[PDB]
Every structure is written in C-alpha cells, then in structure tokens.
Assembly symmetry: C2
Homo-oligomer: 129 residues x 2
C-alpha cells in the first residue's frame, strides 16, 4: 500500500531496523448460533424456502443445516434455478442443488411434493416464531 | 416476496393447510482458523499494522486477536483515524480504538513508540511467514 511504503521509507530514513510482514499470529473465530426460517411447512412435514437471489453464504448455511439436522426435509423453490452461482460461474443454483442432494423446483411447489406421505417433524428441536 | 405470494396462492387454491414462517431451525456456523500478519515488527517488540479502510470485519478480528494473544503489543497506524466506522456512524476509527484500549497513530509510526524499552516477543507462539 502507499501507506505501508511511507511507513517503510520513514523507518529506513531514520535508520530503524524492522521485520516486514515476517510473522503470523494464529487465532480462532468462535462458532456462532443462528436460526433459519423456512417460508412454508407443508402438512406432510416438508419445509419449503422460496428464493430469488441465492448467495454463497445462503448456500453454506443450507449445507450446515442439512449436516446438523439430517431429519429435516427442507426444499427450495427458486424464481429460477438456472441463475448462475455468480456473474462468471458456469454452474447454476439447480446444479449446486443436485450436487448436494437438495430437492428444488422453480416458481411453484410441485404437486408431487404435496402428495408425498407424511413424516414426523421433531418440533422439540425447533423454535416457534 | 412476489414469489412467496404466488406459492401461497397456489397452495390455498389446492386447499393445502400450511404454516407460514412459523418455525425457526437453529444451526451453528463452525469455528474457523485464521492468522493475522502485522505489517511491521519494531526492534523493541511492538507490532504495527497499517490501515486505510478498517471495516467491521477487520475490527472484530482485531478484538479476537487481542483476547487470544494478550502477550502481544499490536498497534495501528491509520491513513486517517477520523474516518467513520461506516456510512452514517457517529464514531471514528480512533474513537473505537480508545474505547477498546487499542494504541494508534496517523500516517507514520510515532517517534516515541520507536523509543519505548524493548520487550521480548514470544516467537514460539508465532508462525514465520
């Protein structure tokens, strides 16, 4: 940076020795608690989240929830599952979903999802809004 | 949400009873491991980080570093300590530093910091770049 160079030059002109970007200090960012609220809970126990833009942080959250709550059935309905992960990506939302086993559709909840046999929802593990 | 409105209307037209944003799924964002590299290390043991922009993310990391490595003396030289924390904030970088006991200066390293008596740095706690 311009700032860094002015600081370096100043030290040098005064003959001050120094170590430059020589040492790393490790540290850990603690784990944090959050909540995610699906838009709909269907009678057969399927949760559905509707999404327009779907950012990288959202994708990550999705994977964490899946790994932490294998018993929940959370699906996504996209304005478009063809949108790319980002401006230059070759992969779309839908592709990401198929890669990670996330059930999804576009625009509306498919009639077949609604017909699936009921399954229990561990509400005790959830927090009512 | 226009999309959410279309999903709801479709459900209602099929007589589907659903719970709308009624349940929150708790989840945990995992701890993450990082390292921070001060720009300069002076002969007396003082570490100096130079910053132009110094956003929320950096500030939070700085506090975690101080907490986890209280044995280190890390200070900041800013292009300007008058800069606000973010658009609309009443607080400057310098004021946030004073509130948390972070030593700082503007533009160059103070001649007086260079003169402070030497303190040993526990290099065994650090990682060379």
């Amino acid at each position: 940076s311009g700032l860094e160079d002015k600081v370096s030059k100043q030290l040098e002109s005064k003959g001050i020795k120094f170590e430059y970007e020589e040492w790393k200090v490790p540290y850990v960012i603690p784990a944090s608690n959050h909540t995610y609220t699906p838009d709909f809970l269907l009678p057969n126990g399927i949760f559905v989240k509707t999404k327009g833009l779907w950012e990288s942080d959202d994708r990550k959250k999705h994977l964490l929830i899946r790994e932490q709550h294998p018993e929940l059935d959370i699906r996504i309905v996209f304005s478009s599952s063809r949108t790319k992960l980002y401006k230059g990506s070759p992969t779309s939302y839908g592709e990401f979903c198929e890669k990670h086993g996330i059930k999804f559709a576009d625009k509306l909840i498919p009639a077949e999802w609604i017909k699936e046999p009921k399954k229990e929802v561990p509400f005790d593990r959830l927090k009512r809004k």
